Subunit: 429 residues, 3 copies
């Protein structure tokens, strides 16, 4: 029988709503097909996930090892014994023996059963941890893919900005050849060509870094995805009821893992309680003995045997009690751990919801800003070409336009990362 | 008796001065009352700290478990034994027995005593670690609070900057309606409205993130503090003698923790030394036996018993010596750990002192810069409105003014974080 | 004998080339002599490395402890036994005994041998980890040194930029005193003085922080290096064949560490296999006994003794099999760990190669940009001083010039860090 306390799910340590459903599969959440191809490959070859799978097997084997301790043992024994005096008849005595013995703990108060149940729960927790690494990998690969695509896109706008600045410069040169501009405007147009080449070189770096990170995550080194057009429709962004319950969190693998750890701790309390109670063992044996080898295996020399035993703990100076206290304190630790895991999950979902609003509003504003800058550039050119304003007006408008384009790319990347983070924080596929 | 070496505090691994006292309580260090209310709540509900408290209890129980091993044990035993031959009189022999036995290790050379002392020191170290989590939490909550307030303040100046830019734009529009300005100036004034809306949306994000981080730290989800006015007087910044001794560091909990770990290691050396010496045990028992159950508990079948024993290690192939070496090497590791903890603490205090000077000087300079920018803006407006300069003068002055205001807010936040870090690095309250 | 599987190096988990040799010693790689002096000091006093050295000693001792378990033991025993009835002749029986006994496990199937070999391999792995900390420290010290030098250089250009801005301001003042400029230009020139003072204060902070980090790494607090002139020739940057083989990675200490861990796991498989097989032990003793102490050590009371024993596992409910499974699964884990270590190393080398190209191209472009900005500044001054353009042209050119200089310093630092990272990722000296 078991002395373990019954499982009780701790009180929800977070509000019941995120601020006032089930995810689709990742094959549906991700629209872009390239990212899905990379995710599938990662699921096969990624080393971290492979390691997480092996840890599940290990824990399964440890469960088996511990469970085995509940079953009877049967073992053989062989012995020979020479001995004699040191004075007063120096004749050697000699005896041979052979034992075949079985052993069995009755485990009436469930010590061994519960140590086993604890290992089974650790195994269950380990499977959940595995599931967590699985969804975190899907998230990470996808993000890594979009980071690569961001690098491509940044490189692309940098090159077309280079082309633009080269045209601007050629034009100012032509003007100068007609004694129509000045040497200041020319040097300004030349400068921005160089800073743009610098940006190009930077984006090449980031691309290479993105590629290398992606290949580490895949655990494979085949050809990388090429640049593709990517947008808000690349993901099927989560739609959520207005009063989505916090209870969705309890479905994440990492939270289920914590739950199983809590059950393991309950089982360890049962095991520690059992120590206070009598324990009954049983050993039975077939045995033989003889002073010489010849008549050893003689039925004549044989003996059967059957010996039940009971041990009764009486006083142990608070050993059992201290050990029980450790188990109880550790169960309390598991409860806090469970609470921490949920509070952390709640923070991830709340942040991603807030960030979704913030990022959408930043992007919208940034788009309107860009449109205004394009108009500004056009007006500045016209006014400059008619000698009404200095070339600094053109330079300034170009710089801001280019910076805004790079910022807008970064924001769209942040938006996709956040959508992926949200999906994942809700438990993924 | 104990074979452990005496404790000796390692030579100070850092200079004796920080570069040429006792903290007040956090209730006094923090002036702002809101932050103190949040700190008090965190001290109650925060999960990390609760977990640190449970670890102290666990270590206390482990100390008790180990100490118990020093005391006598008294246990019961019950047995029944059926056995018989296999040929040549197949009559079964049967014997029942019941033992009540006491056990006691004399521990003359302090093996068990020292293993106990080691656990007591681990327990002491664990209390110190707890105290460390406690002061780190006070620090973190306070910082998290000021980060929230920074977000509020950034949002506030962004909105008033929005209002300003809308007035600027309305004015340029009016000018245009009088054929007095141009379409370039108008588009420039429009643009900055949009970039400011973008900043507003960003600050809303950061606010939401700040709120969520603060609630994670509190472990509670009641209403959040509203924006309040915050300044250098929100903290009672530490005043330090010119030649403050490094010795103040030895009062931090994390350093005391290291000290207790060092004592534990000393105790483990004592325990390992004891293994080389004889060990004396003592077992005494009341016992009975009979071939049938009826005359079992007969005083007739009973026997008392008393058996002192001594074990003497002679040769063990370097087992004891290797084990002693591990203990000695581990004590050396504890010494290095202690040194590392102090050197790290010294770095924290030195950095915060340097940062205090740097930040004060940056803020002072930035204030003078801001004042200059306000004047510049005013002059640019006047000159622009009289057709003496382009609107780019106004735009440029506005942009720099706004950026400087945001920078100044960030610097004041950094200053408070650094003051808090300094307080904490000196051991907190 | 050993039941362990033979070592087989896992298939290379990365491409055979980095994208289409041996490092020199760090004394040769680093040209700058100051950095080498700091590296030498760190190698002596650094706490992390000292700790890594102690861990090697600890593992060596654990190897010795485990190996000792393979050798015979010889121990002494002394006993006295008083016992008597409880009724029916209350005369006490009394017996004294003294045993000297030897013990020896034959270890025919190599259980103990392999547990020893596992510990020897853990020791070997620990030496490699030590070597890793050693090369990582050389890297970190060098980087920390160049970061200090970066701080010095940033402070220096900030001060000369301050001097420049003060001259610019004095000039505008003079112009105003001749009713030749305006109050806008003056306030603009004043502003940039203040922002530059802010930068100066920031660089003082960073310098102080750099110094404190460097002293933590050195584990010593003597005088710090002063500013020196530093450039691309401070390091003898690695030259690599076009088709450098990935195989160079297998020379890194961290990868060799993984290899030894793999061998340890192989040994543990051997140990677990041995459990299925019979085990033969041997105990031999000299012994005495007597009812009184006087005739105790009488050769008369003495007995010699010799007892070989064999244990044969028959059925254990899958205990041995589960334990074997754990060992096999753990060996598979070591293989994955080995693969991870290599893939990670491959990423470090690939990133550093890409970054070397990117950084060189950014620096080249940034130099050309700087040269263009110097010309722009000169042209703007001339045009401004002749009333042809506003002072905003001068301000703008100064700001960009100063920002580009700071950026160029940061890029040169990044280049040196990357060269150091490359050297280190290839196995260092």
């Amino acid at each position: 029988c078991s002395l373990a306390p019954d499982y009780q799910r701790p009180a929800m340590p977070v509000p019941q709503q995120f601020s006032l459903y089930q995810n689709a599969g990742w094959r549906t959440f991700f629209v872009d097909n390239q990212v899905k191809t990379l995710i599938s490959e990662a699921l096969v070859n990624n080393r971290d996930l492979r390691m997480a799978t092996l840890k599940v097997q290990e824990a399964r084997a440890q469960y088996r090892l511990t469970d085995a301790d509940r079953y009877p043992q049967l073992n053989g024994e062989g012995s020979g014994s020479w001995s004699g005096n040191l004075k007063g008849n120096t004749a050697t005595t000699r005896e041979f023996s052979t034992g075949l013995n079985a052993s069995f703990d009755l485990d009436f108060f469930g010590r061994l059963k519960n140590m086993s149940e604890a290992e089974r729960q650790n195994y269950l927790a380990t499977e959940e941890a595995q599931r967590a690494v699985h969804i975190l990998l899907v998230s990470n690969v996808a993000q890594s893919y979009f980071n690569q695509q961001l690098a491509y896109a940044q490189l692309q706008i940098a090159e077309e900005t280079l082309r633009n600045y080269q045209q601007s410069y050629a034009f100012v040169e032509k003007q100068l050849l007609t004694g129509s501009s000045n040497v200041l405007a020319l040097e300004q147009a030349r400068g921005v060509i160089e800073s743009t080449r610098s940006d190009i070189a930077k984006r090449q770096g980031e691309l290479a870094q993105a590629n290398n990170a992606l290949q580490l995550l895949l655990g494979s080194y085949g050809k990388l995805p090429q640049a593709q057009t990517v947008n808000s429709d690349s993901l099927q962004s989560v739609k959520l009821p207005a009063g989505l319950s916090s209870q969705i969190l309890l479905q994440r693998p990492d939270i289920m893992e914590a739950e199983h750890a809590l059950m393991a701790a309950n089982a360890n309390i049962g095991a520690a309680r059992a120590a206070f109670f009598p324990s009954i063992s049983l050993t039975s044996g077939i045995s033989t003995a003889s002073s010489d080898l010849s008549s050893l295996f003689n039925a004549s020399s044989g003996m059967w045997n059957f010996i039940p035993k009971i041990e009764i703990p009486i006083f142990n100076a608070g050993r059992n009690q201290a050990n029980l206290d450790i188990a109880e304190i550790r169960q309390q630790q598991s409860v806090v751990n469970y609470e921490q895991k949920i509070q952390n999950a709640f923070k991830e979902v709340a942040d991603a919801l807030a960030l979704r609003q913030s990022l959408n509003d930043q992007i919208s504003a940034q788009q309107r800003y860009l449109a205004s800058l394009q108009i500004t550039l056009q007006r500045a050119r016209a006014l400059y070409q008619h000698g009404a304003v200095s070339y600094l007006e053109v330079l300034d408008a170009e710089r801001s336009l280019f910076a805004t384009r790079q910022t807008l790319l970064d924001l769209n990347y942040a938006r996709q990362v956040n959508e992926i983070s949200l999906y994942t924080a809700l438990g993924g596929g």
